[PDB]
Amino acid sequence: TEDQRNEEKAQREANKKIEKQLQKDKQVYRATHRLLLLGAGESGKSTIVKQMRILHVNGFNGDSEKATKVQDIKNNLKEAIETIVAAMSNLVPPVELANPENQFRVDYILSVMNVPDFDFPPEFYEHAKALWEDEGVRACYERSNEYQLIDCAQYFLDKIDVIKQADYVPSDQDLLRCRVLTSGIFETKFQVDKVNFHMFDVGGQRDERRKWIQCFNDVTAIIFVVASSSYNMVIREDNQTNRLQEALNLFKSIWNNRWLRTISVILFLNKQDLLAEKVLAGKSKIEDYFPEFARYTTPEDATPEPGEDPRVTRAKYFIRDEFLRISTASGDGRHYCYPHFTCAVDTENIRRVFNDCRDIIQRMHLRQYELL
Amino acid sequence: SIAQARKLVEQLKMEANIDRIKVSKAAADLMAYCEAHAKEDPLLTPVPASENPFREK
Amino acid sequence: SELDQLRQEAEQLKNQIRDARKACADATLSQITNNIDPVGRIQMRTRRTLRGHLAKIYAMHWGTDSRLLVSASQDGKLIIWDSYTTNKVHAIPLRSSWVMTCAYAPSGNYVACGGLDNICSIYNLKTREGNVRVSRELAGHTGYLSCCRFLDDNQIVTSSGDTTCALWDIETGQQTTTFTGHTGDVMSLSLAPDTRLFVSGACDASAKLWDVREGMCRQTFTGHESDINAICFFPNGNAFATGSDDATCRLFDLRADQELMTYSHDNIICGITSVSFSKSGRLLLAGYDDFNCNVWDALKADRAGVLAGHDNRVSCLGVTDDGMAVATGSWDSFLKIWN
Numbered sequence A: 001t002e003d004q005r006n007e008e009k010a011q012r013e014a015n016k017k018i019e020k021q022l023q024k025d026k027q028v029y030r031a032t033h034r035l036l037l038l039g040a041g042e043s044g045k046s047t048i049v050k051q052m053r054i055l056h057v058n059g060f061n062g063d064s065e066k067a068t069k070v071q072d073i074k075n076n077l078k079e080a081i082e083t084i085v086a087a088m089s090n091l092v093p094p095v096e097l098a099n100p101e102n103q104f105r106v107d108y109i110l111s112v113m114n115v116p117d118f119d120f121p122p123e124f125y126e127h128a129k130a131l132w133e134d135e136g137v138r139a140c141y142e143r144s145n146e147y148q149l150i151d152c153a154q155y156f157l158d159k160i161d162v163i164k165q166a167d168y169v170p171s172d173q174d175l176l177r178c179r180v181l182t183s184g185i186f187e188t189k190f191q192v193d194k195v196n197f198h199m200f201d202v203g204g205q206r207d208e209r210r211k212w213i214q215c216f217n218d219v220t221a222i223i224f225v226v227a228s229s230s231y232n233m234v235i236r237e238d239n240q241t242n243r244l245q246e247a248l249n250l251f252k253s254i255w256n257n258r259w260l261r262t263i264s265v266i267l268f269l270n271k272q273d274l275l276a277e278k279v280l281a282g283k284s285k286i287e288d289y290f291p292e293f294a295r296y297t298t299p300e301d302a303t304p305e306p307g308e309d310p311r312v313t314r315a316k317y318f319i320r321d322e323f324l325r326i327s328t329a330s331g332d333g334r335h336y337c338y339p340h341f342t343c344a345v346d347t348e349n350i351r352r353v354f355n356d357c358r359d360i361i362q363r364m365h366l367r368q369y370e371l372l
Numbered sequence B: 001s002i003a004q005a006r007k008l009v010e011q012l013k014m015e016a017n018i019d020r021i022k023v024s025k026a027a028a029d030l031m032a033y034c035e036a037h038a039k040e041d042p043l044l045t046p047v048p049a050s051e052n053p054f055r056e057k
Numbered sequence C: 001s002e003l004d005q006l007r008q009e010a011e012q013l014k015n016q017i018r019d020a021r022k023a024c025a026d027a028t029l030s031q032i033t034n035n036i037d038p039v040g041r042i043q044m045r046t047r048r049t050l051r052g053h054l055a056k057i058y059a060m061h062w063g064t065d066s067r068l069l070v071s072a073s074q075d076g077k078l079i080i081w082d083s084y085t086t087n088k089v090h091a092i093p094l095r096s097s098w099v100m101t102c103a104y105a106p107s108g109n110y111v112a113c114g115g116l117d118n119i120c121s122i123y124n125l126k127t128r129e130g131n132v133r134v135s136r137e138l139a140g141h142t143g144y145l146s147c148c149r150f151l152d153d154n155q156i157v158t159s160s161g162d163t164t165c166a167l168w169d170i171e172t173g174q175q176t177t178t179f180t181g182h183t184g185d186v187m188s189l190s191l192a193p194d195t196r197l198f199v200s201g202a203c204d205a206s207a208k209l210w211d212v213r214e215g216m217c218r219q220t221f222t223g224h225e226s227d228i229n230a231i232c233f234f235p236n237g238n239a240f241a242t243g244s245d246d247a248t249c250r251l252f253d254l255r256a257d258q259e260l261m262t263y264s265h266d267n268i269i270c271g272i273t274s275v276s277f278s279k280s281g282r283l284l285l286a287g288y289d290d291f292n293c294n295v296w297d298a299l300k301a302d303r304a305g306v307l308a309g310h311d312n313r314v315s316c317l318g319v320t321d322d323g324m325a326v327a328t329g330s331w332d333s334f335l336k337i338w339n
C-alpha cells in the first residue's frame, strides 16, 4: 500500500504549491493601501469612489450597464420633480403655483408617484419641464431645506430635454451627480505611480451600533466625508436631527472607537461648491443653526483660495474646526486627523486633493508595518 | 408601528403558555449527564499518548 | 388608545413570565453542584500551530471527521487544514475579502462563508474539473452575514445583521423558512443535536429558541447586559451557553426556561468572542479579547484553566465531535490546536 505513502507525499506538494502561492499573495497584500470611507448618508462617499474609477480604472460598460445608468438618472429626475411639487402644500406657509392653469400638470405628477413600473412617457418630461419653469415651483425648491430633496435635483431638472431623448448617452458628470443607494460593499482597486490602492465603501442605511466596525481595525487610513453644506438640513430617519450635528456625533464615535485607536483619519470637508453657494445667498445663515458661529474668529493660518469671499473663508473653517475640536480632545498621538476641503463632483479637485494625501498615506502604511 | 405591537402581544402569549419544569430537576439532569459521559470525554479524562492523534510520532 | 393599550398588556405578559420563571426556581445550579468534586488543574498544550493566513482570522469550523477544519481570514482566503499533518488541502480565494463566518458541511462535500457582502457563498469541495471555486451564492439578506451552519448538503441556516435568520434551499436559492424576532444584529447561531431547533444570539442582549420547521420563536432568554457575540448548545440539547461583551458567560436550560448560572470574574472586563462545550459538557471553553481562552467548569462556575498562546484577539474556537482537541483562531493570523 505505498500509495498510502504516495498520498502523504501528494499531500505535501499540494501544500508546497499553496505556500508558494501564498507568498506571492503576501506581497500583493503588503503593498496594498486599504482605505475605508465613512460618513453620514448623502455625504459623498460613493461619489469619491466614482472619481477613483474615472481617474484610474477601465472597467466594463456593456448594454446592461448603460441601461442601468440611464434608468437610475431617470429615477433621480422623477423623484426630484415629484418631491418638490408634493411638498408645496405641506410647507408652512404653503406655496402656490404662479400660473394656476398648470394645475393639471401638478395633478398628473402626483398621480404617477409610487407606481411600480413607470414607462417614462413623453408627457412626463413635458409636464416636469413646464412645472420646473414655474416661478412658484422654484420658490418651493429654494425652501428644500424644509423637506428631503436629493442634491442633484436642479442639475437633472435643467437638462430634461437631454435626458428624455432616445439616444441619450449620460456623461460622466451625470454619473457623478446620480444618487444611488449603495448596498453591501462598493470597492475599487487602482495603481498610481506603482503604488496600488484599495478603496471600499460600506453600503446600507443608518446603523447606530456599528458592529461591523471591527473589520477595519487594520486599514491604512479612514477617509471621513462631511456634507458641510448640510448645516441647515435634517437627516432622513427622524426628520429632526441636524445633518451636520449627526456628522459630528458619528465622527466622535469613529474617532473614539476602541478598534480604531491607531487608525488615522483623512477628513474630506465635501460640498464646498454648495457651501459657498449657500453662504453667499444669505437666506440660511449658519448662526441660526449653530449659534457659536457668531462668536467665531477666522484663523490667521487660514489659506483662502484666489477670489474667495471672506464670508466663505470663515464659514468653511468653522465647520473644519468643529471636527478638529473632537480629534484633539483625545488620541495620545496614536493617530491623527488631516482635514481637506473637497468637491466630490469636481474631478480635477479630487485628483489634486488625492495627490496631496499620497505621502501621508504612504508612511501611515509604513508605520503599521513598523518600518518607520 | 401598530402592527408590531400586536405581534409582540401574541408572541408573549405563546411564551407564557409554556410548561416549565423546576430547576432542581433540570440542574439534576444536566449534572447527571456530565458524570455519565465524563469517562468518555478526552479533555476531562486525558487518554494516553498512544491514543491522542496530536501526540503520536 | 389601542396602541398604548397593547403596550401595557405587553408589560403584563412580561411580568407574568417573570413570576412563572421564579415559581419553578426552587433551587440554584450552584447549590446542587456545590458538593461535586472539582475537575482539578486542566492544562492543555499547543500541539499544532497552523501558519497559512496573511491577516486576521475571523472564523473556523471543524469537519465531521474531527481531522479537517476550514478557517476564514480577511486576506481574501479560505484555507482548509489537515490538523494531523499541518498540511493545507485548499486555499480558496474569495470575491469579497471581508469574511466573518465559515461553515463546513457535515458530509464534507461543501464549505460556506460570508461577511459584509450580505451573501452566503457555497464552495463545492468536489468539483469535477477545476479548482475549488464558488458554486452558489445565497443572496437576500439586507445585512452582514454573521454566522451560518449546514443542516444537509441542500440546506443551511444563516444569521445576519438585519436582525433576521433564514433557512435556505441551496439549489433553488429560496428561503424555506425565515426567523424574525430580534431587535439587534444576530451575531451567532447554534444548531441543536437533533437539528429540530436552534438558538441565536443577537445585539439585543437576548437569545431565542427557534422552531426550524415553522419559524416560531418558542422561547426567549434574557439576563445579559450587552450584545451577545457567541452561542453554543449543551451536548444533550436541553441547554446552551452564551458569550457577551459584558465579560460574562451564562447557561440557560430550555425546559426550565431561565438562566441557570453565570461565569465571570471581577478580574475580567473584556467581552467574549466564542464559546464551546466539551464532549461531556462538563467544560465550557470561551475566547476573549484579552488574547486568551478560559476553560470554565460548567457545573461549579469556577475557572479550571487558561489557553494562553495567542498574541491578539481570540476570535473563534471549537471542539471536535470526538472531543479530542480544541482549535482556536485569533487576529494574530494563527490557528493553534489544543488538548
Ligand SMILES: Nc1nc2c(ncn2[C@@H]2O[C@H](COP(=O)(O)OP(=O)(O)O)[C@@H](O)[C@H]2O)c(=O)[nH]1
Binding pocket: A039, A040, A041, A042, A043, A044, A045, A046, A047, A048, A151, A152, A176, A177, A178, A179, A180, A182, A270, A271, A272, A273, A274, A342, A343, A344, A345, A346
Ligand atoms: N454639488 C455637489 N454634490 C455632491 C458633492 N458630493 C456629493 N454630491 C452629491 O451627493 C449625492 C449622494 O452622494 P453619495 O456618494 O451617495 O454619498 P453617500 O450616501 O455617503 O454614499 C450625489 O448624487 C452627488 O451628486 C459635491 O461636492 N458637490
Ligand SMILES: [Mg+2]
Binding pocket: A045, A046, A180, A181, A182, A203
Ligand atoms: Mg452610498
